[PDB]
Design an enzyme around this catalytic site. Structure first.
Site, mmCIF file in Angstrom:
data_model
loop_
_atom_site.group_PDB
_atom_site.id
_atom_site.type_symbol
_atom_site.label_atom_id
_atom_site.label_comp_id
_atom_site.label_asym_id
_atom_site.label_seq_id
_atom_site.Cartn_x
_atom_site.Cartn_y
_atom_site.Cartn_z
ATOM 1 N N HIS A 140 1.259 -1.211 0.205
ATOM 2 C CA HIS A 140 -0.010 0.496 0.205
ATOM 3 C C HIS A 140 0.480 1.334 -0.035
ATOM 4 C CE1 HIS A 140 -3.617 2.696 0.624
ATOM 5 N NE2 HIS A 140 -3.431 2.597 1.742
ATOM 6 N N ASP A 157 -3.819 7.781 4.299
ATOM 7 C CA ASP A 157 -4.312 6.556 3.805
ATOM 8 C C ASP A 157 -5.508 6.617 3.232
ATOM 9 O OD1 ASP A 157 -4.287 4.155 3.869
ATOM 10 O OD2 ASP A 157 -4.628 3.543 6.268
ATOM 11 N N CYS A 210 -4.254 2.901 -5.568
ATOM 12 C CA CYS A 210 -3.568 3.601 -4.181
ATOM 13 C C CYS A 210 -2.776 4.555 -4.059
ATOM 14 C CB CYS A 210 -3.431 2.885 -2.797
ATOM 15 S SG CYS A 210 -1.662 1.651 -3.692
#
EC number: 3.4.22.-
Length: 266
Positions: A140, A157, A210
């Site tokens: 990630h 995030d 992401c």
């Protein structure tokens, strides 16, 4: 009692979810270190205050604070005509790097994270394993914006709590913030503040968007450091990613004819 019909379609109960995820995965594929760096170089041409920090190798959960401190201490040195001590970039001359440090007001720190590795080296090793097989896996991208001008650390995030709960990251970043007050002090003694950007999962339905999400948030922050764009998002997961897809396409066109593996002039 009559037996329930078991259809000769093994996956039909999941068709809707599968179709949405396939659609999303196709809309916004994975962005890795190289394209992120190109995007940052481009962003610098639009916002000279942004220093296009190299993402190779990227920062991790184990060394992002040390990397930020090194950069800020080097910026402090440059503004005083003193020698820099931090690691130098690969794609930039030392002199041009000094000019970027003198000019920058914002550090875009991309962190690559994976739950499994317990060291910096393990993380790098994991990064290599995944790259050669072309898999994202459980990895990630996270973004830490160090806004020097506003004295603000912004943590983004896109999965909301992938590393840890947002209050735990808040705590860690708040301790780091007061370290920065000593490392990079301000005249008026204004303290570094911390902002956890995401109040919920943004990246719903995707395992690959992401990188693009981080760059989109950064661009929103660059347009307005008080942006509430994360709140003005469409509810639908597919609609979010088709908007992101237009962003991605615009960025990829914008950098297509830009120089490869070289920092722009400060």
């Amino acid at each position: 009692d009559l037996l329930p019909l078991v259809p000769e379609q093994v996956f039909v109960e999941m068709y809707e979810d599968m179709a949405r995820r396939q659609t999303i995965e196709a809309l916004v594929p994975a962005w890795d270190s190289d394209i992120i760096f190109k995007c940052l170089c481009y962003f610098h041409t639009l916002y000279p205050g942004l220093i296009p920090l190299e993402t190779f190798p990227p920062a991790t959960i184990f060394n992002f604070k040390q990397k930020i401190i090194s950069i800020l201490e080097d910026k402090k040195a440059v503004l005083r005509g003193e020698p820099i001590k931090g690691p130098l970039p690969i794609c930039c001359s030392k002199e041009n790097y000094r000019r970027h440090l003198q000019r920058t007001t914002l550090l875009p720190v991309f962190m690559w994270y994976h739950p499994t590795p317990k060291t910096l080296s393990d993380t790098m090793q994991t990064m290599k394993q995944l790259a050669i097989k072309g898999s994202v896996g459980a990895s990630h991208w996270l973004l830490v914006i160090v806004d020097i001008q506003a004295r603000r650390l912004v943590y983004f995030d896109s999965l909301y709590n992938y590393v840890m709960p947002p209050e735990n990251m808040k705590k860690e970043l708040q301790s780091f913030a007061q370290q920065l007050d000593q490392v990079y002090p301000a005249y008026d003694s204004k303290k570094f503040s911390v902002k956890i950007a995401a109040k919920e999962v943004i990246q719903r339905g995707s395992g690959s968007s992401c990188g693009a999400w981080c760059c989109q948030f950064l661009h929103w922050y660059l347009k307005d450091p008080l942006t509430d764009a994360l709140n003005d998002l469409p509810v639908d997961s597919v609609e979010r990613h088709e908007n992101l897809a237009s962003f991605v396409q615009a960025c990829e066109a914008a950098v297509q004819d830009l120089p490869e593996l070289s920092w722009p002039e400060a």
